[PDB]
Amino acid sequence: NTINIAKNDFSDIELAAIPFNTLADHYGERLAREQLALEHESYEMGEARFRKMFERQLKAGEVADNAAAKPLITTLLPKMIARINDWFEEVKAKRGKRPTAFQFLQEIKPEAVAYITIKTTLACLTSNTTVQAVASAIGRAIEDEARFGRIRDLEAKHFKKNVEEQLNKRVGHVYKKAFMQVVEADMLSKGLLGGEAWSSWHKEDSIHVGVRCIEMLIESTGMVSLHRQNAGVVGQDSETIELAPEYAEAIATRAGALAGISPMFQPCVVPPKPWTGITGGGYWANGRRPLALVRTHSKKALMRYEDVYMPEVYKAINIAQNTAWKINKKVLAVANVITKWKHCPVEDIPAIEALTAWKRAAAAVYRKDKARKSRRISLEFMLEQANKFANHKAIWFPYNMDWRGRVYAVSMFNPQGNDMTKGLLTLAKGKPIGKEGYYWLKIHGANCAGVDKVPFPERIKFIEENHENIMACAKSPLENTWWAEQDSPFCFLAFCFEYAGVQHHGLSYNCSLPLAFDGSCSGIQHFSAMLRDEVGGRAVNLLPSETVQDIYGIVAKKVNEILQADAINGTDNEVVTVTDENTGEISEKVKLGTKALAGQWLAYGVTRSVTKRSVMTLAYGSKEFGFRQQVLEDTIQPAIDSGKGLMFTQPNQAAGYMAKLIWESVSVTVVAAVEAMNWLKSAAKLLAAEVKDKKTGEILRKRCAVHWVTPDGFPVWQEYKKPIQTRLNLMFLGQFRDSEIDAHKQESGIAPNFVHSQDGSHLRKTVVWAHEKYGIESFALIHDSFGTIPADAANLFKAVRETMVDTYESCDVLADFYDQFADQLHESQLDKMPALPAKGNLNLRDILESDFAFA
DNA sequence: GAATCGAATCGCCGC
RNA sequence: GCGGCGAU
DNA sequence: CGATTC
Ligand SMILES: O=Cc1cccn1[C@@H]1O[C@H](COP(=O)(O)OP(=O)(O)OP(=O)(O)O)[C@@H](O)[C@H]1O
Ligand SMILES: [Mg+2]
Ligand SMILES: [Mg+2]
């Protein structure tokens, strides 16, 4: 039931003359044919991908989950619900005893029966056409939502949350229902569902409820026609159900239309098409899916950039596209061997509360089995793409941006991937390495091993002390597994081959390995530079420092100062009344004081591992509440499951105490970060407010989106939007039944999105400034990682600091942010707008002399 | 007034 | 949307 | 612990 788009639509891509000539005028006809054939293959692979998924969803009875059937379902559902309703009054107004199926259909609300019927008849017809068997299919599906939705809807709307996540962790209808069977029995043992065990429907009841549902679908919609066979013959009287061909052609056309616009983007064998406008950049042919400069969730948001003059933004994207890459054949030769022997090549190298705790161990193996299969899937695809382009002289990647302006490569195989993917990709246009390039090659090799918390001379000494090990790895990587045991193994191996090249050829050796420089904590770095935070900036190495500054260990050091103070002074333990709000029981337990809680943590030993997740999620918006879950999940629970954690008698009390100390430490260490996110959150709060006079009720000021402009000239609009109603069932997944600004997501998004737009602007300005003031042509970019060939590494090191000093010396981005929305504020809320946070004593020009900023 | 909720972006794979 | 993986 | 909304 599908139409091959490929025969005509995909043929136009190679045939059309205006795309061919514009490509051939730059790189000739031979490369033009190769590039168009590659893009043609990408669309063909994408069509094949959709069709395999469509047929697998066809075979599994999940055809309503496919995107080609959703536009159908959304116009048939309101008619079904109106007819599902309208029956109920007719039988209630018709005297006499009710039909067999009337009472069952009241146990499930009209919306849920409308979807359950449509999905199950679509499943039964596509994947026996008798009305009896399709009636029982709905009948067993209605009863499942009736019996087990009882748990969700009424008795445990608070306690469902403690089984909702573990229900979602199960995959498969059988596993999900079996878990719900255990949940229902556990609840009844506590008298939670009213003590009423379900009386399962008889098979006679299940067929009769279905034929009521099929008949009501024919009345409301024309999706399905009824057909009788051998009418009047007692033995062979049957009714066969049929999907209406006019609606089958609707999903067929939509399946073909969607199959054309889902290509598998690949690297380019010619340089990518320079961006001159909103669309059509990157790849060279026109396409069923043309590339967009900004990845927006709506076509209206992309059209906002049409006449936006942002020349520096366009130059930055086009320069990055022009960077020539090639597959690292030496690394690829190694990876082609060890992936045949291990599922993950660097995974396991040989080297020298009982119910509720071991339930988590069982869930750990279940999660690990998912993780092992997931990691292997991506590994085999990356290796296939790397081998496909291995013998090419150079390959290129097109680039675009997310709606905040961060720069992303477009192809699935691209240098922004994991350690193996980065290890398989090297720059194509190298230069003689020289003395300076060799020095930075060793620094880059030291960072791949994980020796990055020590000053530069110690990184050099680590490489020079391990000179024998590095040369042994380059000469025979399969015979010496030392490279595989490092923090970034394949990138370390890539350094090993280049290091051996300098030994075999001297400083004239042409090297093209990308040497990445990663900023410490980019979000905190930008916030500290915004408000001139001396203490906060020094913690993220903005300032020149003795050693590499480690904000994870600084917070841990501050945490341990409170722990030892709380171990001498501090509160004692106390008994306090507690009450479970569900059961209503009033009990009394021990509330551990800070003196006891500090002693437990001092026994455990609080290091940077305890604090690392909390500050890492600070820029994402986490705070003292979120830290409690992080500490419980990352530190306390792994300790208890491994025989440690004997000090933690009440883990939630230890977690909440730890979250209080981390939040006190982080909010005192990086002050300007905390103040800046608070100010932006308050800004979005007043913008997303629908202010109104309560007496009149009239809307005085409409809720407003948040809009600002980066120093590079890239504009960004934040308008999180929410749907008005959505329905989710238990065994079968959710489905839609206009949009308004989601004010909650506006508050939760504004601070991370603002700082991410700033680091995108900084990256783009770095790429431009490095390309024009110096002569750098090759760029490796992952959002805050700046890499180039070793001979240009020192200049990139200088350029990335010069741009960051330049913007914040010239732009008050928070004050510029204020100048945008201040006209949109209402009279009643300007008094409640907090003032801009005060700037500090940090001198921005010290960033130029900072060794470990890297950015 | 309480009653409830809530506590970054992007891409791939699966349902 | 949910499950898992990866990138910052 | 605040905002948002019953
Ligand atoms: O971006 C987030 C991200 C995505 C994937 C992995 N990560 C984290 O990136 C860290 C490495 O950078 P750091 O933050 O400096 O950690 P570290 O312990 O101090 O240094 P290291 O020993 O790993 O070399 C890792 O640990 C991860 O949590
Ligand atoms: Mg690290
Ligand atoms: Mg990160």
Numbering used by the authors: 2 to 128, 131 to 355, 372 to 756, 766 to 883
Task: Reproduce the article's own wording on this structure.
To understand the structural basis of UBP transcription, we solved six T7 RNAP–UBP complex structures with or without its cognate substrates (dDs, dPa apo structures, dDs–PaTP, dPa–DsTP, dDs–ATP, dPa–ATP complex structures).
K631, instead of R632, interacts with both 3′ hydroxyl group and phosphate group of PaTP. Intriguingly, we also observed additional density near aldehyde group of Pa nucleobase. Given the published pre-insertion state structure on the natural scaffold had a Mg2+ ion (metal C) at the similar position and short distance between the peak of density and aldehyde group of Pa (around 2.1 Å), we modeled Mg2+ ion as putative metal C21. We also found the PaTP is likely restrained by the specific interactions among its aldehyde group, metal ion, and RNAP residues. The pre-insertion binding site of PaTP requires larger conformational movement to the active center, which is consistent with slow kinetics and low kpol value of PaTP incorporation. Y639, which was interacting with 2’ hydroxyl group in natural base pair transcription, now interacts with the aldehyde group of PaTP via magnesium ion (and close distance to DsTP). Specifically, PaTP is the only substrate to be incorporated opposite to the dDs template.
